[PDB]
Prior knowledge:
It is classed as viral protein. Chain A is mainly beta. The first copy, chain A, has helices at 13-16, 100-114, 142-147, 154-159, 189-192; strands at residues 2-9, 27-31, 43-56, 68-73, 79-84, 126-130, 135-139, 148-152, 165-167, 173-175, 181-183, 195-201, 210-211, 220-221, 225-228, 237-243, 252-253, 261-270, 275-277, 285-294.
Amino acid sequence: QYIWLNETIKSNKQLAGPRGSYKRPVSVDIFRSSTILDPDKNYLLIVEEFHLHKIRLPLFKPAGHDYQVGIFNRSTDEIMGVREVDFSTFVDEDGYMYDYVDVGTAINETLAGLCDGIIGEEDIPVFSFNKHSKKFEITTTENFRNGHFIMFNDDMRVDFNSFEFDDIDEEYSLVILNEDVETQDASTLEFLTPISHIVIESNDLPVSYELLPSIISDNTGVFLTNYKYLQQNNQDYNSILFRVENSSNKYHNILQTNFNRFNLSFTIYDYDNEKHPLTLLPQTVIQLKLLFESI
Amino acid sequence: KQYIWLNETIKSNKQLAGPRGSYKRPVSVDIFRSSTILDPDKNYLLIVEEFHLHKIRLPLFKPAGHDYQVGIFNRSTDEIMGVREVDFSTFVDEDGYMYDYVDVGTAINETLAGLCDGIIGEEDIPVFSFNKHSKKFEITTTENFRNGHFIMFNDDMRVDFNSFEFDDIDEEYSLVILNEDVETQDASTLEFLTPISHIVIESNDLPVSYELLPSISKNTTISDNTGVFLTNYKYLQQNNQDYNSILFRVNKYHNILQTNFNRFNLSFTIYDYDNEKHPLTLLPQTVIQLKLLFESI
Amino acid sequence: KQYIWLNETIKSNKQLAGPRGSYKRPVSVDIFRSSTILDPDKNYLLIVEEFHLHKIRLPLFKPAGHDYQVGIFNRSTDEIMGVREVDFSTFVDEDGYMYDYVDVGTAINETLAGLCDGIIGEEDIPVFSFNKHSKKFEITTTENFRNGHFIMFNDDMRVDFNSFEFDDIDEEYSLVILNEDVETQDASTLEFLTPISHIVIESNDLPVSYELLPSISKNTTISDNTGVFLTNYKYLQQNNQDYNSILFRVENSSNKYHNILQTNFNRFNLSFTIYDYDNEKHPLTLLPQTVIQLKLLFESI
Amino acid sequence: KQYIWLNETIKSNKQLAGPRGSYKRPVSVDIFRSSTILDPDKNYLLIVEEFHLHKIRLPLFKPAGHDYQVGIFNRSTDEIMGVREVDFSTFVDEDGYMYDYVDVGTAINETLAGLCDGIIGEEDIPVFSFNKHSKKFEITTTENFRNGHFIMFNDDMRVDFNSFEFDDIDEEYSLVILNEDVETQDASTLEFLTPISHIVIESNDLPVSYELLPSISDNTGVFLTNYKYLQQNNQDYNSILFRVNKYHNILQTNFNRFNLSFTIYDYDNEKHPLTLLPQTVIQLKLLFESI
Amino acid sequence: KQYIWLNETIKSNKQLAGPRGSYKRPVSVDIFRSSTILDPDKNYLLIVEEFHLHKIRLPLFKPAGHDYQVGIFNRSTDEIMGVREVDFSTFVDEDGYMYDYVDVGTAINETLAGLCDGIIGEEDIPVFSFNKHSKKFEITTTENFRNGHFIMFNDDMRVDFNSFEFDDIDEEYSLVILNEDVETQDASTLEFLTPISHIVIESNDLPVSYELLPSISKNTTISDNTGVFLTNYKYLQQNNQDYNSILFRVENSSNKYHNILQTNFNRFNLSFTIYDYDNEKHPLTLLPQTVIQLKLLFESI
């Protein structure tokens, strides 16, 4: 026996707020007059599909990183200076950033402020994001490359690993520049994104919880599905579509048969395990299809 | 274990469909057999193995669901010169749909040209357009416009054409950051413009178990609402193609409640993102194919 | 559970198939075993695990299906100068097929040129054609033609060459919007032209359950009809390739099983058959160079 | 329900395989265990979960299969000037194979050049060649050649190099239409030219249910797996990876020894083994699944 | 029937793993639950659903495995002028690995340049190098070098850099055919250079059935060897990326189940291990920025 349950959420300006400023969590109450399941049977739950049409996800989270840029002199053979990359001007209230151009601007302003006293404005290097290639780029003069190197610390080195590097120190590495415009060997947006996965969870649905580590552990958490997210490009706004294939093992046992209501909520888990709820926009449309399959 | 396969097909012509499909005839099939289809002692599941909607027409855009507004900002005086609501009424068909993204771009452009009429000199009027080859919208401007003015997109414009670079200025409006004569999107956004969500096969008289639905009443939460659906095909708009040939090939089972039938109807239906349903209709050139599998447990 | 695999092959040559496969010999395989294939005590499901139609020729267009018409509009006088039906009769072989999209483009171009022969000067006659590289049709015009006139497509032409930009004048006719000297399609429309729907393996003497089909009559809905179908491969015309090498392999956990009814047999025939969109069936014919592989599975319950 | 996995591997060296695999040592593994593999009471199915043929060499062409012929037509006189057969014998190895599509393009070009040697001058001799970048064969000509002459392909050339535009003059020969200096193919046709049909793992001593084969017939042949090979590019040396309901019945559950070979079937069905190289590292993972 | 889901995650920092992961701490996690995990009466299978090795370093080349040799040939005198062995020792790390194909290109180049020292002019010395953009090795030469000489690759080089156009002269050595200033490979060969074969999850103290391995010894061809393996991720080197973010999800190849032998347990240890093509094993090691995620399915029968 296959029991199918469709659900939808609309939105508008009045429910969500301008630019979704009310941060209303994505949630649906399911509520039926009749009972949903047959008392004499045992049911596995699986989420067959969902569609998160028109939502806004963050692209970068400064708190998790400790970036540091520096300048190295080739004649004198020493470190001239090192500065910490200051994101506080570009961050929203919740500690997020929504554009990889701005990650590049932050890194650039730190780099420009460091070379203010030391190097002439003609040769101050420029760090920027290229919208077309999805790659960060370093733009420099020939005078700069003969005189100096740009230095990255390890956090920078790892997240922007597609540049060519030379290790000088336990921490710091030199960026090897051979041309006016130097770009990344490969995109590294996967390394920058804080989003790990999006999850459907219910406080009141009688379903066997998944086993977790501690905040030794006896900890548990309700998870109906587990969507792994990957930042493909610089798109702040997204339309995320999920559909299972022929033999997905992603079932969950239902412990009690007799219920006529429950709540479903969409939540985002970051790479540092800070969970936060997915919120509506005026234009958001959410769709959802649960299967209850008898054993 | 038993595999009963039921093929079915619809040919079309000008008589059935009308010129350009103007009769709006629903896609539908009666399957009528002399013998009974299923064996009385078994229980069966139903899955749609494949279908083909060869030569059909689908809408590319539905203006009713959007509130697009463009505006001009003056950098010298640092204030809003005007804001106008984009008017799609001269581009829309009788059922509220549009069928070309070049036309979506023209609609936006004419609003922009009307808004700039007295306020900016003709040579410096910016041009909004859809690029057929890249499937991206573009803004074309003079350097003299860029030094003087910004184009303003409201929140709905902001979201649906999100791959331009923006700068917020208040609760509602956002400035389009232009640095070159031709400025284009970083990424196609046709998925944000299409109104078509899914195509569904349904039936009024096939003895098959319903799916549970949220209530018809949009305010109330309680629901005893159901509906027959045999399959659920998610549609994604890949490009600027009005006319399509949709092909589907195959967990998606449905229980058959009673065994004693030889008649049923099948109808293809389109659901939009605003949940309004409407029938898939024929063209003269439409050919439709369909394959059901009744599978015994 | 039991798995009984049955590999099979077909070779060919000039004598068997004829020059360029001109004898039209159907692809057919007598399987014949000395021993009985299946064990009497068990029930068996049949699935075609893979095949390979190496080096065959399929048609790309079938003029019978289509009612193409082109016209010329005059923008000065704002009326139709003329309209003509597109005639393929010279390009078509015996069977009613065409085998190259360059020819499809030529036939439309001829019709268009013959329509402009009296009226418009030879220097700015428009040129319809098929671009081999992009797999897209193209309209080549002069600026003088564009200012003066429009090319008209009818409803059938409109649908099958849908990627051009169009303005609809009438219930029937549409004007092709041209802004530049060489105008092309937004997207490939070869899927709208290929007459091949699917390719089928059917046996005239294998004890296997038949698929239910709709009635032969256009007038009656009540159906008794049935057909033998072992597999049903959906074909899609990717490019302008006349000759093809078609390979099918069953994905993990498909449902394309048929019940076998009788458990006692040691011979059966397998033909390969092509269905078109108009439901006209015709057999897959050999070439001299045609190798054909095939692999059935008989799976017990 | 029981899953019993059997990892296996092969290594190699100069002394085992020879310079450029010149010994032709077949790929083979003797599995031999102290304990009995399977339970005596149960029934088992055999599926090959994954194999990796790392650093191997496979032929790209086999002239034996093909009967190519080229010709020159004259447009002024309107008649066939000559027809020569394409001789591959200079580029072929001992086993009848060829290992690069540029050499396939050269062989046809030498035949084409030899046919125009007496008739047309060197300035207008057409040039047949393989483009390494596009994976497509090209015909280079002059304007003087195109106005005067055509190039004739026979039916076997016509089917394997089908992407060119053609005009049929008779039952065997077809003119290649040419409008520019460098004319090329509509699409890649390496799938036509490759003689490798599939790659098979076959035993000679394992108790497993055989697959029914043709010859009236009563033949049978043991095959543990079947990998369908397709030629993606002009890469002579390869690294073939396979990961997976391709099951087989194990007839007897009392054994602890068998010999797994690797074999290459061609489109003419002529079978031959997969030979090692010094650098080769072959991997394999069988599954025994219970009922 | 029952589906028990076990989630596990690992974080890191400077103190834990060391600057650039200098301490080489292996990736390992202890699962310790106060309750028993499984129900006594049922029989459970184990499959790994998904893991995510976020921000980790992996080697791209392992010189020990190869014996590369380069040579110079003289076209005038028609003989070998010399053959040097490619020395990687100045580029390798402590553990025998190289983390950049640019550096593999330089190694070959230094060897090639040193071999031309006495014999060829500074301008006409050929240059071998890796192209970051195309992922292909290139040979930059003068017209004067090509008219006078050829570069010679031994068999090991010939295989791993097979996409150049070669010509055999003897059993070991092969000329590289060069017709332009810059000559590139026809296709990528990074698959031929990577030493990482697969990444593996294993456990010393989980009661689960072991897989059957071949013999440790060269002498006795008979085997008795077994190993504990929870999953087997086949790795493929896409590009020149030193640092990686490896995601696995069981979508297809879902046969990778393992029989749990004992139901009575509440604790085990999961460790990540890398196997190379010479079958040497070494652990996966953390970095300060590494985050590892894991999900296990215990499924009953």
